[PDB]
Structure 1
Amino acid sequence: LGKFSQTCYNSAIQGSVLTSTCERTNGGYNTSSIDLNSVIENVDGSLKWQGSNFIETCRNTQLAGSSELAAECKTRAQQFVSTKINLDDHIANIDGTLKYE
């Protein structure tokens, strides 16, 4: 996966945003940016790639009561355990629309 740097140049980081000028298949170049805030996290002072979608390592997702997400998730030891999270923690009703905050 990845390896952009092999076919790009003039890469720069400002805040969480990477910008680079990258070679297109047909020759010629394009400049683009990617915001890394959604995919990199700080874990106890170390930059980590954010977990892969929880759907890939959890199964049997259900609404428990009015606001809890329940699932069976794989531990690092590769066994499934019961877990839940209160979606009221961060999911709001903003004028009729569900929004993360």
Structure 2
Amino acid sequence: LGKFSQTCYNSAIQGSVLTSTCERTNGGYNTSSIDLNSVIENVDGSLKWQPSNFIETCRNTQLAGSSELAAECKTRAQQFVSTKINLDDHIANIDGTLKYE
């Protein structure tokens, strides 16, 4: 798995985002970025790999009502089902700024 560095150049990290210019199969290059926040985590001071994101396996995300996140997400069986989660559970307004807690 991985090995992007072997066929890319001008790689850089800014915050949690990795950007690099990579070779395409038919030749030529493309510059792209990837946010590592959803795949890497800090476990007691050590960076460790983490499962994949949520937007990679869920679609049609919407704000239902005033605090509900709704979406259609893939099951282990690769089928989409309806799901929702109350953002009021952990998203707070800390003096005007949205913060997770």
Question: Smaller-chain TM-score range?
Answer: 0.5 to 0.7
Identity percentage of aligned residues: 99
Cross-structure match for 1:33: 33
1:6, distance to aligned residue in structure 2 (A): 14
Greater mean deviation of Cα atoms: 15-24 or 69-78:
15-24
Distance, in Å, in 1 between the alignment partners of 2:81 and 2:30 is 46
Instruction: State the TM-score, normalized to the length of structure 1.
Output: 0.54
What's the CA shift string for 1:59-80, capped at 9, x where partnerless?
0000010101000000010000
**Counterpart secondary structure, 1:55:** coil
1:50, distance to aligned residue in structure 2 (A): 3.0
CA contact (8 A) 2:38 2:51 kept: no
Greater mean deviation of Cα atoms: 83-92 or 35-44:
35-44
Distance, in Å, in 2 between the alignment partners of 1:30 and 1:60 is 27
CA RMSD in angstroms, aligned pairs only: 6.3
- Shift in alpha-carbon separation, 1:51–1:12, aligned structure 2, 3 A: same
- Shift in alpha-carbon separation, 1:43–1:64, aligned structure 2, 3 A: farther
Instruction: State the TM-score, normalized to the length of structure 2.
Output: 0.54
CA contact (8 A) 2:38 2:52 kept: no
Q: Which runs of 5+ in 2 are unaligned?
A: none
The count of residues paired between Structure 1 and Structure 2 equals 101
Larger Rg: 1
